[PDB]
Amino acid sequence: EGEHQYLNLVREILERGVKKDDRTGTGTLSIFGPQMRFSLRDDTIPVLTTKKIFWRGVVEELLWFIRGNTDAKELAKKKIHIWNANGSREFLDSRGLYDRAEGDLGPVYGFQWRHFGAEYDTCSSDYTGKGIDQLANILKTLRENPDDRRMIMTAWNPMDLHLMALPPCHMTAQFYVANGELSCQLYQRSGDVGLGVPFNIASYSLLTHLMASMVGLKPGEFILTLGDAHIYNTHIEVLKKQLCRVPRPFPKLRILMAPEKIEDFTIDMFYLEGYQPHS
Amino acid sequence: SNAMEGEHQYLNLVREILERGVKKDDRTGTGTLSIFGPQMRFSLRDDTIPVLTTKKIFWRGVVEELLWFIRGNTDAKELAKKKIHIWNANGSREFLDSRGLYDRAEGDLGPVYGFQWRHFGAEYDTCSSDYTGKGIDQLANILKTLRENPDDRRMIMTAWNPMDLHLMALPPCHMTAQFYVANGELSCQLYQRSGDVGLGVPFNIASYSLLTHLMASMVGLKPGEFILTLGDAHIYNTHIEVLKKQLCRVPRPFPKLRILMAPEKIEDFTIDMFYLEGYQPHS
Ligand SMILES: O=c1ccn([C@H]2C[C@H](O)[C@@H](COP(=O)(O)O)O2)c(=O)[nH]1
Numbered sequence A: 001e002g003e004h005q006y007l008n009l010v011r012e013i014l015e016r017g018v019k020k021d022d023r024t025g026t027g028t029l030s031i032f033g034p035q036m037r038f039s040l041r042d043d044t045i046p047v048l049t050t051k052k053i054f055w056r057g058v059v060e061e062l063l064w065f066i067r068g069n070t071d072a073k074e075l076a077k078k079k080i081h082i083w084n085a086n087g088s089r090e091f092l093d094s095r096g097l098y099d100r101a102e103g104d105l106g107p108v109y110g111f112q113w114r115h116f117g118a119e120y121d122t123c124s125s126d127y128t129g130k131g132i133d134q135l136a137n138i139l140k141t142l143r144e145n146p147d148d149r150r151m152i153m154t155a156w157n158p159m160d161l162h163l164m165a166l167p168p169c170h171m172t173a174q175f176y177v178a179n180g181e182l183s184c185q186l187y188q189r190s191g192d193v194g195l196g197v198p199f200n201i202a203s204y205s206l207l208t209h210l211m212a213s214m215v216g217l218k219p220g221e222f223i224l225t226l227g228d229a230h231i232y233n234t235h236i237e238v239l240k241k242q243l244c245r246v247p248r249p250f251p252k253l254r255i256l257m258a259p260e261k262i263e264d265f266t267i268d269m270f271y272l273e274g275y276q277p278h279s
Numbered sequence B: 001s002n003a004m005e006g007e008h009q010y011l012n013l014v015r016e017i018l019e020r021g022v023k024k025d026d027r028t029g030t031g032t033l034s035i036f037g038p039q040m041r042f043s044l045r046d047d048t049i050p051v052l053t054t055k056k057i058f059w060r061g062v063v064e065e066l067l068w069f070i071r072g073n074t075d076a077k078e079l080a081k082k083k084i085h086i087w088n089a090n091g092s093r094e095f096l097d098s099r100g101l102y103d104r105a106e107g108d109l110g111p112v113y114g115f116q117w118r119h120f121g122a123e124y125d126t127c128s129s130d131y132t133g134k135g136i137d138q139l140a141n142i143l144k145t146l147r148e149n150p151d152d153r154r155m156i157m158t159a160w161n162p163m164d165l166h167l168m169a170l171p172p173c174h175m176t177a178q179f180y181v182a183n184g185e186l187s188c189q190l191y192q193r194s195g196d197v198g199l200g201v202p203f204n205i206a207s208y209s210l211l212t213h214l215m216a217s218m219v220g221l222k223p224g225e226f227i228l229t230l231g232d233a234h235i236y237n238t239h240i241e242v243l244k245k246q247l248c249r250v251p252r253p254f255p256k257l258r259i260l261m262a263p264e265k266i267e268d269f270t271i272d273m274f275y276l277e278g279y280q281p282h283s
């Protein structure tokens, strides 16, 4: 049912979610363990049509993850300011990272993907050949042994959590191949269904399409498995309004080229075709 | 996944892989029927524990393997002493040599499951080594969080340590678990990257459901649900006919777990402290 899976999850949380408080104390409606499956066949990419998704933000954040970058200032340079708050002096101080420079998020997401286990210094440091390159290893495995049942990429490193501005949310992904098609399952421990989740869906779906082009496979499915899937009490009314919007068909991703190395992908190499969101 | 489908979810999953699974080769290439991403949900309410009734589950094996994980133990010889021989093959001289672990003593599985639960990040020496206060005790940290901040969305326990994989006899299967609390009920979701639906999966279901029941008793919570999320869910070509025969079996109601006491520390639980009530499997 495509987008209707997302909209039915919103509906389910509104109707059956339990009243649960978050870190600050801000209330949520919550359910545990829901799953959503999106077809990536016929170039489809699940970018929501009932709300306009910040596609440029999705792309730049992903490429920044793929490069193994952790400097929020590098995103701020591209006019993507989604990570600036968690890289602020006041926020880093609140986490006990007083020595850490402004915008230096620590060994978050991408650093774990490309350099798992490497000793973190700063965001500007040279990490070439440091730690375990999980992403490069998955790409080599998809080319040489696509039936492998261990194609895991994790950002969940218990030893580095204290060094991160925030612990990973979209924490573990698994890759799978069947009938020349690449599928991805993301385990996400916590999901703000109203804000973060639509962005995570577009992000990992883009990652799967990009990875498929790297290894001569076709995109299959993207599965999002959530832990605590919740709606903030402040979002209920705006989400109720979004539920009345009739979805339009999902856009198609057009990849113009794939470079030799996945970290050399630029926003110019691919684009959304027929993206018609509600205004 | 729907909680009150009980054992029918499992029988529907077997039927699903049988009818819709793709022909996929494994490590050796023995052949499987495979599907990606299926989920099962089991209610642990009213003391229910999802131990399959369409096939007899080795309950004593489930229990002793779990307690051995909870203790952070990795010596297959310690399991063998309890007449549980399920890990003996992967601890054998021939198998350890096949993994390039020639220096490794027989039965020493390396930093597998339980060692990661209790000592994530600790430097592994042998199975007999003293690891008291070494590495990150994920299980003890989850238990403290369940007592102090049950709404926490970071109660993760992982065995997936990329740096230790080469030291293990086998990479972790049941790799990451998340805990959750709502209305005084404890739920567990397990992410399992690979599942042999015919053999390992029924055992993993009973194992993590037992762990949830045990953890709840430790922290004054009631068991809620156990969610199993699979990556590659498969059936080996050699099991197709035996599984088709199991599909003709009508499930009986699930047994109930009776916990007599909970010790101060979870690693001090013994098989004598709890038992299965009304377990009626097909013979
Ligand atoms: O990619 C992300 C990152 C964060 N969040 C949301 C989930 C929670 O509402 C919040 C993080 O809070 P904790 O789960 O860490 O408490 O941000 C997402 O939805 N997606």
Ligand SMILES: O=c1ccn([C@H]2C[C@H](O)[C@@H](COP(=O)(O)O)O2)c(=O)[nH]1
Residues within 6 Å of the ligand: A149, A150, B026, B027, B171, B173, B174, B194, B195, B196, B197, B199, B200, B201, B204
């Ligand atoms: O707790 C476990 C451990 C293993 N397996 C099965 C899954 C696979 O059939 C096999 C392990 O093989 P790989 O996924 O590592 O290739 O054992 C399970 O079902 N459950």
